[PDB]
Amino acid sequence: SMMQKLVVTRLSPNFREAVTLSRDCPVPLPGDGDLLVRNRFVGVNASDINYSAGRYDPSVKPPFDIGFEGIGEVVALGLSASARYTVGQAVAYMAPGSFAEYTVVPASIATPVPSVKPEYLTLLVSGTTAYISLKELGGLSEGKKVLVTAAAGGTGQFAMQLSKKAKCHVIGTCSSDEKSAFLKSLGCDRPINYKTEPVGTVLKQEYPEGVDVVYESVGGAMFDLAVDALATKGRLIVIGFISGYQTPTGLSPVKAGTLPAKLLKKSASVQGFFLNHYLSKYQAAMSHLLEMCVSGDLVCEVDLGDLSPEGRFTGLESIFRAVNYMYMGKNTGKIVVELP
Ligand SMILES: NC(=O)c1ccc[n+]([C@@H]2O[C@H](COP(=O)([O-])OP(=O)(O)OC[C@H]3O[C@@H](n4cnc5c(N)ncnc54)[C@H](OP(=O)(O)O)[C@@H]3O)[C@@H](O)[C@H]2O)c1
Numbered sequence: 001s002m003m004q005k006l007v008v009t010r011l012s013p014n015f016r017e018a019v020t021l022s023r024d025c026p027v028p029l030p031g032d033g034d035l036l037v038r039n040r041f042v043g044v045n046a047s048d049i050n051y052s053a054g055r056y057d058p059s060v061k062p063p064f065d066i067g068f069e070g071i072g073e074v075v076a077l078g079l080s081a082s083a084r085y086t087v088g089q090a091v092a093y094m095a096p097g098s099f100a101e102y103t104v105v106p107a108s109i110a111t112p113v114p115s116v117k118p119e120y121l122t123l124l125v126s127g128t129t130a131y132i133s134l135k136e137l138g139g140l141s142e143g144k145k146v147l148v149t150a151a152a153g154g155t156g157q158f159a160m161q162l163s164k165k166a167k168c169h170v171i172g173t174c175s176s177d178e179k180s181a182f183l184k185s186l187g188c189d190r191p192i193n194y195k196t197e198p199v200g201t202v203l204k205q206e207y208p209e210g211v212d213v214v215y216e217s218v219g220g221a222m223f224d225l226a227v228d229a230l231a232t233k234g235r236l237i238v239i240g241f242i243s244g245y246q247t248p249t250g251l252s253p254v255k256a257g258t259l260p261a262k263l264l265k266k267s268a269s270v271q272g273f274f275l276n277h278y279l280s281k282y283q284a285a286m287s288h289l290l291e292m293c294v295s296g297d298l299v300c301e302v303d304l305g306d307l308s309p310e311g312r313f314t315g316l317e318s319i320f321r322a323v324n325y326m327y328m329g330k331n332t333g334k335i336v337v338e339l340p
């Protein structure tokens with residue numbers, strides 16, 4: 001009848017200062033073509049703070065719902081949606097407003113899943129982003145050298161594994177020896193703990209002819225290093241630049257004044273990627289991702305915060321903790337919050 005949900009009440013990249021937990025909200029009713037989903041797990045994404053900052057559409061004032069992805073049970077649906085879905089059915093989705101106990105989701109974008117497991121949620125945004133970007137833009141093939149930053153993170157774990165399946169030689173950056181071990185377990189050829197080992201030097205010495213593809217999620221100095229490390233005809237894919245998201249503009253400083261010159265000299269490229277521009281590829285990506293997940297051919301690491309200071313991310317209120325956890329760089333795999 002009523003429920004809790006998170007609401008952006010003030011525009012800001014500081015999640016805590018931007019978002020409020022609202023405690024007596026009416027449970028929304030699904031339309032003819034909608035599902036009403038009781039969320040059991042929701043995804044925490046780096047860009048959640050870009051969203052709370054209002055950067056997706058600056059013409060939109062608070063309050064508005066937040067959260068990009070969820071998985072749970074269909075508890076109610078409109079008549080038309082009932083042709084495909086049924087009450088009690090497990091579904092996952094990528095749609096705004098997942099940070100709530102119940103979310104209305106158009107049946108046409110929902111993804112039927114085998115059951116309500118957090119592993120399936122990792123595929124929705126993090127998995128598809130890696131799958132689609134690398135397939136469409138990566139030009140992957142046997143022997144290509146691929147550099148993945150934030151490699152032990154939500155989407156990084158997939159860029160890593162998929163590149164390995166494409167028979168590429170893969171290098172991955174992360175911030176701890178434990179993260180490096182995780183990378184090794186995913187078949188990383190060259191894990192690099194950037195806190196203990198200078199990435200630029202590793203690249204210059206061990207990969208003198210450069211890397212062919214960069215899956216770049218960090219920005220700033222890491223972006224600078226990756227540009228310098230590009231091989232002839234190399235491709236740097238701008239997936240993100242999380243090092244800048246908390247700043248007032250959300251940007252990270254780069255030493256890019258000489259970027260065009262470097263790109264010309266190497267016939268190399270810098271290519272942006274935004275998941276929402278590739279939705280025509282989404283259903284197929286998710287279909288394949290789900291196969292590998294269920295068959296065990298893809299590790300879908302979940303960080304539910306069980307080893308965080310305050311423990312398992314349970315309840316909407318723990319979303320604040322979980323966001324902070326990401327930005328402290330503590331997570332291995334996808335950050336997920338449970339709503340018991
Ligand atoms: N374009 C798209 O459609 C799309 C879709 C999904 C995600 N993304 C991007 O992919 C990247 C990762 O997002 P995610 O949600 O999956 O997060 P995530 O990788 O699971 O976690 C972020 C990781 O980045 C590193 N990091 C955190 N704060 C940092 C900081 N201030 N400076 C440098 N590094 C920091 C940490 O790993 P370390 O141990 O390596 O430092 C941290 O664990 C982000 O740029 C996100 O925006 C883009």
Ligand SMILES: COc1ccc(C(=O)c2c(-c3ccc(O)cc3)sc3cc(O)ccc23)cc1
Nearest residue numbers: 130131132133134135140162163165166167297
């Ligand atoms: C350019 O098109 C592709 C598509 C898939 C691949 C690839 O090798 C694989 C996958 C792939 C899918 C999407 C990507 O962006 C990269 C790799 S997944 C997978 C699973 C297996 O058991 C065996 C191989 C693969 C390589 C190039």
